[PDB]
Design a protein around this ligand. Sequence first.
Ligand SMILES: Nc1ncnc2c1ncn2[C@@H]1O[C@H](COP(=O)(O)OP(=O)(O)O)[C@@H](O)[C@H]1O
Ligand SMILES: [Mg+2]
Ligand code: NA
Ligand code: NA
Length: 382
Amino acid sequence: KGPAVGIDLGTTYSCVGVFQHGKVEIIANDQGNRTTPSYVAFTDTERLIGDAAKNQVAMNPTNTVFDAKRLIGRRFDDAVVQSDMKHWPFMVVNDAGRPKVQVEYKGETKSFYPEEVSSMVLTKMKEIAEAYLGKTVTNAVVTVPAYFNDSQRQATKDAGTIAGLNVLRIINEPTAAAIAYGLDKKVGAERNVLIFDLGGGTFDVSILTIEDGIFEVKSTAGDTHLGGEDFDNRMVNHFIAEFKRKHKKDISENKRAVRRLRTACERAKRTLSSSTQASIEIDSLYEGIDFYTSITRARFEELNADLFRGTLDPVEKALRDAKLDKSQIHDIVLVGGSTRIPKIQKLLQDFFNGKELNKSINPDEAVAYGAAVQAAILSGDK
Ligand SMILES: Nc1ncnc2c1ncn2[C@@H]1O[C@H](COP(=O)(O)OP(=O)(O)O)[C@@H](O)[C@H]1O
Ligand SMILES: [Mg+2]
Ligand code: NA
Ligand code: NA
């Protein structure tokens, strides 16, 4: 037989892990990255998935699809879909009430249902695992947001089936993260856990009550449109202004310049989580002017101060809904790539009056990690 894997199918980044020999293994992709963008692109000659897809979005914007998780298992007439599509560069069409993404592949106009797009990403995670294990992967546990209704979960399960994956079970992301830290073990008492998940485009706060190995999602809050990308945009707008000072030029109209600057900012942002300053070196940004500059952690923090601080509002709402006080939550676990930001960790820790944060597992790998452990037990591998 082959091992069952756990897959985090995220809105912006996906991740795959496998439990083996009592240890979980987060599998890196072709480019050596431990998570891969949930991007798919269609060109004259091929279909690009993952890094290869994100690595060309500024050149092929209308045929590069992302955010499929926002469409999956949803209707076209949905207000959510109507609002969201106002910001997508690709086309979303109505087909018998179901939304479809319309792209141009090899010269021909083609359309796909959101579950078909997610299955492509699902196939990429599968081959990534297979390349590592050196054996075919069939069984898997895929995760989904706690707020997903039956249709969304059905669609997720379907994306898995068309990818050739035998979905053993669909489990909630916050639950998967708790399992990763072994907070599912029976300690003969009720345990309140807060999952603070700040990813690429989504923010989710979940309070789980665990008793005798049984999870109960007592409350959830967050923001469907708040994540790492919003932090990037603040840096971009900031550098657009700086370019205007130094070179008296407004590069705003140039879509390519902005996207290239955005990519540069996202990378600088990651450096700032471990360093106090980072350089932005972009050759021939606008016309032929090279944009060489830098940002400090201090500046990064003040550019996003309101956004970082607002991150606590949903935490308070979550608490009151669960009818719990700060002192009642026993464990806090950080999830999502953006929780690597020092100011975020300080804010949360300060709010919980100095409580220790569970963060030894890379936050952006926590969900996949939890799903892999779950996949093991459901296959008797553990
Ligand atoms: N060191 C880091 N510092 C800040 N942000 C980071 C870091 N590493 C990754 N990220 C950000 O995490 C986000 C991706 O989060 P992730 O949780 O992996 O995605 P998703 O929300 O799609 O599941 C992006 O906004 C990326 O810039
Ligand atoms: Mg996530
Ligand atoms: Na993810
Ligand atoms: Na997220």
